[PDB]
Design a binder for this molecule. Structure first.
Ligand SMILES: O=C(NCCc1ccc(Cl)cc1)c1cc2c(Cl)cncc2s1
Ligand SMILES: [Cl-]
Ligand SMILES: [Cl-]
Lengths: 339, 621, 63
C-alpha cells in the first residue's frame, strides 16, 4: 500500500547518497598525507595524579583557563581541581548518586552534570552569598543524561538515552529546541567552535550533524559496526572524530560528507570510551577499556604513542585549550595529567 | 536497686529502627499507643511539647481514673466533677469540640444519674480520633519517637544469661530441677527462676513436658493475670533451661492444708474465687489446665493465690484432647474415658474435687484413705457423691453443679463458662471486681521467717526456639523501675554530645541532602574488629571513623551475594565480592542485622538491574 | 508507521540535497590546517620546561 512505496523510495534516496559520496572519493587522506613526515615517538608522562574520588570516574571537562577541571564520579560527587597544584577548589555532593557526565561553563561561573536522575543540574560556583548551590534543575528528558556542553551562561546542549538531544534556556528551564532523529541511546555530543552546529554519537551506530539555530539534522554519518561512545570536533569545524565499541576510531569530513580515515590495530579489540584532538588537530587521543589511552597520527593513521598509567578503564579525557596538557579519568578513581 | 545499668543506643539508631518497624507495620497510633513505653513517650510529647494535644491527653487520663473507681457513690461524685470542670475548655476549642452524638449519649446517662465505669467511652473514641492524625505525625517527627526506637532496639536485642540475674536461695524442688529466688540486675525486680536440668530431662524422657510448659506459659502470660504464675522470660544455657516467673514465697496450698487442717466454707470461698478467675483467664485463651489440685496453688507473702505448673495443660483451640491426664481423684469422667474428647469442662470437675478436699481432707472419690487408683477412677465414673449434712445449701448447690458427670449438665459448661460459676448462690456475697483487685483478706498469711551424660546437636535442636521475652511484661518491669532515671541520664548524655559537636565544629550531617537509604554503626574485619559508621546509598556502601568524612567504600556492583554466618558465637553478614574477595560485617543488635541484610540485598539487586541497561556504566566483553 | 516513513523520505531528501566537495580537496585543507598550527601545538612541538606549568615553570597567577 502506501508503506511499500515509501520503503522503496527510502532505498532510492539512500542509493543516490551512496553514489554521490562515491563520486567525491577521488583519493584518500592517507594518499594526500604520504609526503609529510611522521610525528615520531610521542612519550608523554604523568605530571600530576589527582586523588579524591572514592570510586569510578565517569567524565571530566577542562575549564577554558587550561588549569581548572571538573570530574564526575560513582562516589556521587563533582570535584573541581586546580591541576597546577592538585588542590581541590570545590567538592560538590550531588543529590543523585547516579551521575554520568559533567561540564564546565566557558565563563568558569557554572558547572553542569547529570545521569540516571534524567536531569541536567546547573551549579553556581562563585555565588553572591558565598557557597556552591544548585541554580537550576533541567527536567524534560525521558531517559538518562549522557553528555552536556554550555554554549554560554544561559544556554546548554544535552544528550539523552531517550534518543534525543536538546538545547535549553537555563533561565526558563525549558527546551528551546529538540533534536529528534537517532534510533537508539545518544552517548556523546560535541559543539563546533563557532557554536552554530554540533554533532552527536549514538548506539544506533551513527553520528548526526545538527543545526543549532534551526533545529534540524543536516547530515548523517555511518560506517561504525557498533555503538558510538564518544565524539569530537576537529579544531577548524570542518571534521570530527568518533570512538566506538567496534575498537576503531574514525575521521569524518562534513563537506566531503564521508569517512576519511580509520584508526585501528589488529591487537586492539576493546572499545573506545573517549576522544579528543590536540590543538593543531594533528594528534587524535583516544581512551580505551584496556586501561590505555592511544595517541594516533590523525593525518597518517599511525599510532604515535601510549598513555599507560591507569589500573582500570580510561573512561574519559580532555586536552586543554592552550594545548599544554592531556587529562585522563579512570575507573580506578584517579585522574592523571600528562605531557 | 539495680546493680547493672541498661545503656540505650544513640539517637542515630532511628535510621535503622524506623525502617524495621515500618516494614512490620508497627509505626501506627494503635500499635504504639497500646504499648506501655509507647504510651508514656506519647503522653510526654503531648503534655510537654505540643500545646494543642495537651488538653486531650489530660482529659484522657482523667477518664481513666474514673474507670477505676470501685463504688457507684464515687462515680456519681466524679461524673459530676468531670462534667462541671474543664469540659468548658473543650467546648470552647474550635478545632476540638466533642460531637453532638457523644455529648447527647453522656448527658443521657448522667441526666438519669446512671454512672457506669464506661460512662465517658464516647469521649475516649473522639480523643483517639483527634490524637491519631496530625498529632501522631508530629510525634513521629519528634525526638520522643526517636527515644521510642532507642527503647525498642533494647527490647528486640534481649539475650539473657545467668549473669543477668542475682540468684539467691533454693525455694522449691522438682524432678527435672529446682526453683530459685532471684533479682534481675537490669531493673532490680524480684522474680522466681525455674531451672530445669537438660541431662536429667533426657534421662527420664521428659522433653515434651518441658517444651509444652514453655508453649503453655506463652499463651497464658499476656494480660497480667493476678491469679496465674506467669512468665516474663524464657532462656537457656548449654546445660539448663530457665523460666523467669512471678515470685511466690508463701508455699503451696497442699502444704498449708496439711498444717492448718481443713478449711471452713468462708476460707474456702476466698481461694475458690481467686482460682475461678485464673481458670477463666486460661479458658478465654483456649487452654485447659487439667492438673488443678492444692499442690498446684501457690501463696504469695500476703496469702493471695495463683495457679502454678502448666506442663500438663493443653491448647484446645484447634484440636480437642482426649488422653487421660491429671491427678487421680481430680480427673473428670470425660478425661478418664479414652477416645472421648474434652474441652475446658475438665477443669470445673477438678475444681469441685479440690474445693471438696479443702473442706474434708480428701478427694470425694477417694474412700477410706485408699491408694488404689483403679478404685478412685471407677468411683468417679459411677459413685454418686454423698455430700455431708454439715455443708450449707449454697455450697451443696455449687458442688452438685461442678461434679456433674455429664458435661451438658455441669456448671461452667452450659454456654457461658466461668460466669455460670461466679453467679452460683455460694458466691452471692462477693463483688467479683474486688476479687480481681485482690482486696478480700486472705485467711492465711504465711510465716515470714544422679548421673547423666551426652548432650548432642540432636538434643540442643529440641530447644532451638526456647528463648522468648514477653513484650508487655518487660515494658511493665522497665516502666515501674528504671525508665524514668535512664531517660533523664540519656537526655544529659545527648545534650553533652550536641554541645560538644558545636564546640568542635563538626555539626553537619553527611546523610542529608543526598539519596542516602540508611545509616548506622557496624563492625568490619584479620583478628580484631574495627567499629565504624556506615552510610548506604543506592550505588555504594561508604564508611567513616570519628571526626572525618568517609574515605573508603564498597560499590553495589562488586557485591555478588549477602548471606548470614556465625564467626564464633555471634552472627555476622558475609558479603561475597567480585573476584573472590570477602567482607564480613558484625551488627550491634538483631534488628540491625535483619535490616542491613534486607536493605543491602535490595540495594545490590536494584543497582545491578539499573547498570545492565546503561552502556556507559556496565561491564563490556 | 505511515507517519514515520514519510518523515524519513523528507529527511533523506534533505540529506541528499547537499552539495559535496572532493575528498582530495577536503583532505588537503585538513593537512594544511595541521601544518599551519604545528608550531603552536605543545604536544607536537615541545616548549622549554621553564614555560610549562607541569614541568619547571616558576611563576603562576591567581584563580
Ligand atoms: O512450678 C512450680 N511448682 C510446681 C512444682 C515444681 C517445683 C519445682 C520445679 Cl523445678 C518444678 C515443679 C513453681 C514453684 C514456684 C516457687 Cl517455689 C516460687 N515462685 C514461683 C513458682 S512456680
Ligand atoms: Cl543454677
Ligand atoms: Cl498482693
Amino acid at each position: 500500500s502506501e508503506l511499500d512505496q515509501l520503503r522503496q523510495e527510502a532505498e532510492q534516496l539512500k542509493n543516490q547518497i551512496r553514489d554521490a559520496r562515491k563520486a567525491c572519493a577521488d583519493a584518500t587522506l592517507s594518499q594526500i598525507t604520504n609526503n609529510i613526515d611522521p610525528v615520531g615517538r610521542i612519550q608523554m608522562r604523568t605530571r600530576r595524579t589527582l586523588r579524591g574520588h572514592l570510586a569510578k570516574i565517569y567524565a571530566m571537562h577542562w575549564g577554558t583557563d587550561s588549569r581548572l577541571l571538573v570530574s564526575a564520579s560513582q562516589d556521587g560527587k563533582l570535584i573541581i581541581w586546580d591541576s597546577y597544584t592538585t588542590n581541590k577548589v570545590h567538592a560538590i555532593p550531588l543529590r543523585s548518586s547516579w551521575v554520568m557526565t559533567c561540564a564546565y561553563a566557558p565563563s568558569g561561573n557554572y558547572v553542569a552534570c547529570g545521569g540516571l536522575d534524567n536531569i541536567c543540574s546547573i551549579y553556581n560556583l562563585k555565588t553572591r552569598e558565598g557557597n556552591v548551590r544548585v541554580s537550576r534543575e533541567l527536567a524534560g528528558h525521558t531517559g538518562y543524561l549522557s553528555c552536556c556542553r554550555f554554549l554560554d551562561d544561559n544556554q546548554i546542549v544535552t544528550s539523552s538515552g531517550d534518543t534525543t538531544c536538546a538545547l535549553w534556556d537555563i533561565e526558563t528551564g525549558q527546551q528551546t529546541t529538540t533534536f529528534t532523529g537517532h534510533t537508539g541511546d545518544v552517548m556523546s555530543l560535541s559543539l563546533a567552535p563557532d557554536t552554530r552546529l554540533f554533532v552527536s554519537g549514538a548506539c544506533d551506530a551513527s553520528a548526526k550533524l545538527w543545526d543549532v539555530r534551526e533545529g534540524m539534522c543536516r547530515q548523517t554519518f555511518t560506517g561504525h559496526e557498533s555503538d558510538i561512545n564518544a565524539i569530537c570536533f576537529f579544531p577548524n569545524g570542518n571534521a570530527f572524530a568518533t570512538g566506538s565499541d567496534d575498537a576503531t576510531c574514525r575521521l569524518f569530513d562534513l563537506r566531503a560528507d564521508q569517512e576519511l580515515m580509520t584508526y585501528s590495530h589488529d591487537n586492539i579489540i576493546c572499545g573506545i570510551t573517549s576522544v579528543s584532538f590536540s590543538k593543531s588537530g594533528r594528534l587524535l587521543l583516544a581512551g580505551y577499556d584496556d586501561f590505555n589511552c592511544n595517541v594516533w597520527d590523525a593525518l597518517k593513521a599511525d599510532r604515535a604513542g601510549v598513555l599507560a598509567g591507569h589500573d582500570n578503564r580510561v573512561s574519559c579525557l580532555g586536552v586543554t585549550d592552550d594545548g599544554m596538557a592531556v587529562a585522563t579519568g579512570s575507573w580506578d578513581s584517579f585522574l592523571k595529567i600528562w605531557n | 536497686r539495680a546493680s547493672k545499668k541498661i545503656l540505650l543506643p544513640e539517637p542515630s539508631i532511628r535510621s535503622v529502627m524506623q525502617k524495621y518497624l515500618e516494614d512490620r507495620g508497627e509505626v501506627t497510633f494503635e500499635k504504639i499507643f497500646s504499648q506501655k513505653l509507647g504510651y508514656l513517650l506519647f503522653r510526654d510529647f503531648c503534655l510537654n511539647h505540643l500545646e494543642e494535644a495537651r488538653p486531650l491527653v489530660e482529659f484522657y487520663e482523667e477518664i481513666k481514673k474514673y474507670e477505676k473507681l470501685e463504688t457507684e457513690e464515687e462515680r456519681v461524685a466524679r461524673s459530676r466533677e468531670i462534667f462541671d470542670s474543664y469540659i468548658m475548655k473543650e467546648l470552647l476549642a474550635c478545632s476540638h469540640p466533642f460531637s453532638k452524638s457523644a455529648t447527647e449519649h453522656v448527658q443521657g446517662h448522667l441526666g438519669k444519674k446512671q454512672v457506669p465505669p464506661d460512662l465517658f467511652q464516647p469521649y475516649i473514641e473522639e480523643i483517639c480520633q483527634n490524637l491519631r492524625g496530625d498529632v501522631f505525625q508530629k510525634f513521629i517527627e519528634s525526638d520522643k519517637f526517636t527515644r521510642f526506637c532507642q527503647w525498642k532496639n533494647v527490647e528486640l536485642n534481649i539475650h539473657l544469661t545467668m549473669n543477668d540475674f542475682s540468684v539467691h536461695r533454693i525455694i522449691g524442688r522438682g524432678g527435672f530441677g529446682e526453683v530459685y529466688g532471684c533479682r534481675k540486675a537490669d531493673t532490680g525486680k524480684m522474680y522466681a527462676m525455674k531451672c530445669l536440668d537438660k541431662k536429667r530431662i533426657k534421662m527420664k524422657q521428659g522433653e515434651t513436658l518441658a517444651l509444652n510448659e514453655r508453649i503453655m506459659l506463652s499463651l497464658v502470660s499476656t494480660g497480667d493475670c493476678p491469679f496465674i504464675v506467669c512468665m516474663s522470660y524464657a532462656f537457656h544455657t548449654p546445660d539448663k533451661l530457665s523460666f523467669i516467673l512471678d515470685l511466690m514465697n508463701g508455699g503451696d496450698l497442699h502444704y498449708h492444708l496439711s498444717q492448718h487442717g481443713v478449711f471452713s466454707e468462708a476460707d474456702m470461698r476466698f481461694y475458690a474465687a481467686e482460682i475461678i478467675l485464673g481458670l477463666e483467664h486460661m479458658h478465654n485463651r483456649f487452654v485447659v489446665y487439667r492438673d488443678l489440685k492444692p499442690a498446684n496453688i501457690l501463696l504469695d507473702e500476703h496469702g493471695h493465690v495463683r495457679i502454678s505448673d502448666l506442663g500438663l495443660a493443653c491448647d484446645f483451640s484447634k484440636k480437642k484432647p482426649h488422653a487421660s491426664v491429671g491427678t487421680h481423684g481430680y480427673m473428670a469422667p470425660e478425661v478418664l474415658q479414652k477416645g472421648v474428647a474434652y474441652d475446658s469442662s475438665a477443669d470445673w470437675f477438678s475444681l469441685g474435687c479440690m474445693l471438696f478436699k479443702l473442706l474434708r481432707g480428701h478427694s470425694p472419690f477417694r474412700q477410706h484413705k485408699t491408694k488404689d487408683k483403679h478404685e478412685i477412677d471407677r468411683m468417679t465414673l459411677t459413685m454418686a457423691v454423698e455430700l455431708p449434712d454439715s455443708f450449707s445449701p449454697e455450697l451443696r448447690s455449687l458442688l452438685e453443679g461442678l461434679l456433674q458427670r455429664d458435661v451438658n449438665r455441669r456448671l461452667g459448661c452450659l454456654g457461658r463458662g466461668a460466669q455460670e460459676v461466679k453467679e452460683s448462690p455460694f458466691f452471692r456475697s462477693l463483688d467479683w471486681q474486688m476479687v480481681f483487685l485482690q482486696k478480700y483478706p486472705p485467711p492465711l498469711i504465711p510465716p515470714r521467717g544422679t548421673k547423666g551424660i551426652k548432650l548432642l546437636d540432636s538434643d540442643q535442636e529440641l530447644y532451638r526456639n526456647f528463648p522468648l521475652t514477653i513484650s508487655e511484661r518487660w515494658q511493665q518491669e522497665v516502666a515501674e523501675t528504671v525508665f524514668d532515671t535512664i531517660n533523664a541520664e540519656t537526655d544529659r548524655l545527648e545534650a553533652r554530645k550536641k554541645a560538644k559537636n558545636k564546640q568542635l565544629g563538626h555539626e553537619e550531617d553527611y546523610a542529608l541532602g543526598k539519596d542516602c537509604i540508611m545509616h548506622g554503626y557496624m563492625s568490619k574485619m584479620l583478628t580484631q574488629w574495627q567499629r565504624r559508621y556506615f552510610y548506604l546509598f543506592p550505588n555504594r556502601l561508604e564508611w567513616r571513623g570519628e571526626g572525618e568524612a568517609p574515605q573508603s567504600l564498597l560499590t553495589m556492583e562488586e557485591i555478588q551475594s549477602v548471606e548470614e554466618t556465625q564467626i564464633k558465637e555471634r552472627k555476622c553478614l558475609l558479603l561475597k565480592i567480585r573476584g573472590g574477595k570477602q567482607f564480613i560485617l558484625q551488627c550491634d543488635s538483631d534488628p540491625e542485622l535483619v535490616q542491613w541484610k534486607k536493605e543491602l540485598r535490595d540495594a545490590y539487586r536494584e543497582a545491578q538491574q539499573l547498570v545492565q541497561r546503561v552502556p556507559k556504566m556496565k561491564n563490556k566483553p | 508507521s505511515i507517519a514515520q516513513a514519510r518523515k524519513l523520505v523528507e529527511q533523506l531528501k534533505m540529506e541528499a540535497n547537499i552539495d559535496r566537495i572532493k575528498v582530495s580537496k577536503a583532505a588537503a585543507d585538513l593537512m594544511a590546517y595541521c601544518e599551519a598550527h604545528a608550531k603552536e601545538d605543545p604536544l607536537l612541538t615541545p616548549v622549554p620546561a621553564s614555560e610549562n606549568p607541569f614541568r619547571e615553570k616558576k611563576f603562576f597567577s591567581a584563580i
